[PDB]
C-alpha cells in the first residue's frame, strides 16, 4: 500500500494545465482575468481553491454536467462563427465585468440589446457540416426590474429557444431581485447545446438572449479535471492525486480515492505486508 505522496504534481507525461484563479467554466465563458486560458488544451485541468469569478454574476443550471463534459473534451479551442443578428445592438457590456479600463463582458458571449427602439424576433441558424460535435454556450439574461427588462429588451417578457433537429430547449427569463453580487441584482443563466455532425442549430429569441460567438470543438480522449492545491513540478509520474503525484509500483494506495492516470487501486488499509521470504525462526 502506497500511503505517502511527494506533495507535487509531475508535469509529465500528462499535459497539466494549472488554472491560476480560474475555474474551468470561467475559462470557458471568457472571464477577463481568464483570458490567458483561451484555446488551451489539457490532459488534466488542475483547479485551485483560490479560483474566483470577477465578471457578470452568472449561474449554470446543471453546472456539474457542463463542467464534466468540458473537462472530458480537454480543449478550449473556440471557433468564431458568422452570426447575423439584425436589428439588435451587439457587444453589450457591464461594469461588473471590467475588461481593461472600460466595461466588458465574457469574451465568448455576445450580449444583444435593443437597437434604436425595437428588438425583433431574432431567428438565426448555423449548420454543422463538419465531422465533429460543436459545443455552443449561450445564456439568458434575467433582469432585476421590469424597467431594466424593457430598457434592454422592448418585450415585457422575452424567451429564448435553441433547438436542433433532434432536441429543443426553451428558457423564459424571469424578472426579480437577487442578492447583490459585484454590484448587480441581475443574473445570466448559462446553457449549452451540442450540435452533432450533419445537424443544424436554430436560435429563435425575442429577448434576453446572451448569444454565442461561435462553438467549442468537442473532442474525446483522456482528459479530466481535478481540484487540488498541490504545486506543479518538473518530474515524471503516471499517477496524479489531489495530494500530488505518487509512484505506481505498488498495487494499492491509501493517499486519495481521486486519481488520474495509471494509478494503484485505493484501499482503506494503510499498510499491507506481502511476505517475500520464509518464516523467520531466530536462535534461542
Amino acid at each position: 500500500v502506497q500511503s505517502s505522496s511527494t506533495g507535487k504534481i509531475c508535469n509529465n507525461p500528462h499535459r497539466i494545465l494549472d488554472g491560476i484563479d480560474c475555474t474551468l467554466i470561467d475559462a470557458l465563458l471568457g472571464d477577463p482575468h481568464c483570458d490567458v486560458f483561451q484555446n488551451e488544451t489539457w490532459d488534466l485541468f488542475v483547479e485551485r481553491s483560490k479560483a474566483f469569478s470577477n465578471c457578470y454574476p452568472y449561474d449554470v443550471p446543471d453546472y456539474a454536467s457542463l463542467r464534466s463534459l468540458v473537462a472530458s473534451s480537454g480543449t478550449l479551442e473556440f471557433i468564431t462563427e458568422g452570426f447575423t443578428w439584425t436589428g439588435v445592438t451587439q457587444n453589450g457590456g457591464s461594469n461588473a465585468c471590467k475588461r481593461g479600463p472600460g466595461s466588458g463582458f465574457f469574451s465568448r458571449l455576445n450580449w444583444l440589446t435593443k437597437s434604436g427602439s425595437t428588438y425583433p424576433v431574432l431567428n438565426v441558424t448555423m449548420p454543422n457540416n463538419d465531422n465533429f460535435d460543436k459545443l455552443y454556450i449561450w445564456g439568458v439574461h434575467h433582469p432585476s426590474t421590469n424597467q431594466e427588462q424593457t430598457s434592454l429588451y422592448v418585450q415585457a417578457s422575452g424567451r429564448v429557444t435553441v433547438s436542433t433537429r433532434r432536441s429543443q430547449q426553451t428558457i423564459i427569463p424571469n424578472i426579480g431581485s437577487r442578492p447583490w453580487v459585484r454590484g448587480l441584482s441581475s443574473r445570466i443563466s448559462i446553457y449549452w447545446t451540442i450540435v452533432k455532425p450533419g445537424d443544424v442549430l436554430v436560435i429563435n429569441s425575442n429577448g434576453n438572449l446572451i448569444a454565442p460567438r461561435g462553438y467549442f470543438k468537442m473532442r474525446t480522449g483522456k482528459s479530466s479535471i481535478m481540484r487540488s492545491d498541490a504545486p506543479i513540478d518538473t518530474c515524471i509520474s503516471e499517477c496524479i492525486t489531489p495530494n500530488g503525484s505518487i509512484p505506481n509500483d505498488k498495487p494499492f494506495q491509501n493517499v486519495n480515492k481521486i486519481t488520474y492516470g495509471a494509478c494503484p487501486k485505493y484501499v482503506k488499509q494503510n499498510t499491507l505486508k506481502l511476505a517475500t521470504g520464509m518464516r523467520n525462526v531466530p536462535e534461542k
Partner: antibody
C-alpha cells in the same frame, strides 16, 4: 483589495485565556488557509499554527499543543485563535496571514503568507 | 529544520545587500518595516510577488538561498526573515552615513 482586519489589543492576566479574531475581506475565507504567527516584542517571528479552512484540520507547533485552538466562522468570514493557560512569555503581537493551499495539501508546506493582518498586541504580564 | 542567516547588515542607501538563509532541509522572504506587519517579498524561492520592485531578487544553490536588494533606500531597510514551520533568525537593515 484583500484585507485581514484583526481585533484590538488584549491585556490579560497569567493563567487566563485569550481569543484573537481575524476578519477577512475581499475574498472567501474557505478559499485559503490561515496561519497564525507570533512575534514577541523584538524577538523575531514565531510560527504559532495553521488552520485549514473548508475542512477544519489544524497543525500546531509542539510548543503550543493543547493550549491553542484555532476555529473559523464561515458565516462572518472570521477566524479565531484562542490561547489557554496564558503565560508571561506569550506577550506578543499575533498576526493572521493568508496561505493558499486547503485542498489536497497543507498549504504552509508549499505556499507563502502573501497577506497579513495588522496584528493584535496580546500582553499577558506587567 | 533550523534556518540560519547573517544578521545586522548595515549599509548606506543605493548599493548591494545580500542576505543568506541556509535551509537545513520552499523558502520565502518577508520584510517587516519598523512598526508594521511583515510583508511577503520573495515567494517560491526566486519569485517576486505583485507590487514588489524588480530590485529584490532571490537565488538558490543546492541548499543556500540568498536575497539581493539593489539600490536600497529608506523603505527597503527593515528586518528580513526567511521562512520554510520555521522562521529565520532575522537580519536588520540599517542606513549608513
Amino acid at each position: 483589495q484583500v484585507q485581514l482586519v484583526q481585533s484590538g489589543a488584549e491585556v490579560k492576566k497569567p493563567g487566563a485565556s485569550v481569543t484573537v479574531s481575524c476578519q477577512v475581506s475581499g475574498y472567501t475565507l474557505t478559499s485559503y488557509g490561515l496561519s497564525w504567527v507570533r512575534q514577541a516584542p523584538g524577538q523575531g517571528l514565531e510560527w504559532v499554527g495553521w488552520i485549514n479552512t473548508y475542512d477544519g484540520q489544524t497543525k500546531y507547533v509542539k510548543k503550543f499543543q493543547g493550549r491553542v485552538t484555532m476555529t473559523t466562522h464561515t458565516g462572518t468570514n472570521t477566524a479565531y485563535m484562542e490561547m489557554k493557560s496564558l503565560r508571561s512569555d506569550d506577550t506578543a503581537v499575533y498576526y493572521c496571514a493568508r496561505v493558499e493551499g486547503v485542498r489536497g495539501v497543507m498549504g504552509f508546506h508549499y505556499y507563502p503568507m502573501d497577506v497579513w493582518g495588522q496584528g493584535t498586541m496580546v500582553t499577558v504580564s506587567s | 529544520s533550523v534556518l540560519t542567516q547573517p544578521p545586522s547588515v548595515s549599509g548606506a542607501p543605493g548599493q548591494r545587500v545580500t542576505i543568506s538563509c541556509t535551509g537545513s532541509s520552499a523558502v520565502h522572504w518577508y520584510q517587516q518595516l519598523p512598526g508594521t506587519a511583515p510583508k511577503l517579498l520573495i515567494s517560491g524561492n526566486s519569485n517576486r510577488p505583485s507590487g514588489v520592485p524588480d530590485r529584490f531578487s532571490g537565488s538558490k544553490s543546492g541548499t543556500s538561498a540568498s536575497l539581493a536588494i539593489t539600490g536600497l533606500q529608506a523603505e527597503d531597510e527593515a528586518d528580513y526573515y526567511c521562512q520554510s514551520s520555521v522562521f529565520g533568525g532575522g537580519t536588520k537593515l540599517t542606513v549608513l552615513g
